[PDB]
Design a binder for this molecule. Structure first.
Ligand SMILES: Cc1nn(C)cc1-c1cc[nH]n1
Length: 205
């Protein structure tokens, strides 16, 4: 119901066609995530990806956040396992006026990623945002590589990466010469990490 409540709140209080007011409505409602969203913004602005893959949609906050910065021609593919969330996310994107920039695929990442080239005509991806299941971060990273979907300069950005969580994913991207890594730790006013993200840029084979 959390995702449903968030949407209705947006629908009642936000301005249609204005992604900023949609995001502000979501943030405001949830607090009584801008640190993470701010990092997502910085990555999109720096790498200027033409095709983005998002793993996990939920209420659509991140789809809105990323798609609003893509220029004409640039697109987002969003995978979401839960059809109820995919519906919420579609409504959220319609509300923000970003529906022409995003395609939502319903299903499990491990099933859909291998079908991207043949079934959905993807060549390579410029950016991947990982925010789905944490036990899939490393397997899906490997799957993307092995399916030939990454190129030199493709940026992976993974949410909710806080040690000792995601030991395998981090061991790989850090450990491998094929990835150049940056970590982000948000503490807000605290001494303990509230959210962590990892940026990993593929260097090619
Ligand atoms: C996409 C996807 N694939 N798998 C395995 C989980 C998801 C997910 C998790 C939250 N939303 N969607």
């Amino acid at each position: 119901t959390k995702e449903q409540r968030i949407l209705r709140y947006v629908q009642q209080n936000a301005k249609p066609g204005d992604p900023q007011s949609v995001l502000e409505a979501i943030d405001t409602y949830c607090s009584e995530g801008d640190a993470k969203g701010q990092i997502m913004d910085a990555v999109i602005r720096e790498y200027s990806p033409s095709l983005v893959l998002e793993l996990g949609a939920y209420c659509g906050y991140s789809a809105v956040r990323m798609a609003r910065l893509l220029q004409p021609g640039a697109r987002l593919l969003t995978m979401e396992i839960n059809p109820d969330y995919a519906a919420i996310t579609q409504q959220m994107l319609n509300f923000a006026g970003l529906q022409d920039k995003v395609t939502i695929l319903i299903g499990a990442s491990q099933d859909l990623i291998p079908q991207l080239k043949k079934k959905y005509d993807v060549d390579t991806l410029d950016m991947v945002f990982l925010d789905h299941w944490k036990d899939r971060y490393l397997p899906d990273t490997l799957l993307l590589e092995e399916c030939g979907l990454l190129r030199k300069g493709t940026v992976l950005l993974a949410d909710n990466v806080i040690v000792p969580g995601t030991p395998d994913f981090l061991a790989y991207v850090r450990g491998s010469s094929s990835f150049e890594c940056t970590h982000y730790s948000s503490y807000l006013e605290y001494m303990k990490v509230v959210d962590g993200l990892e940026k990993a840029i593929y260097q090619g084979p």
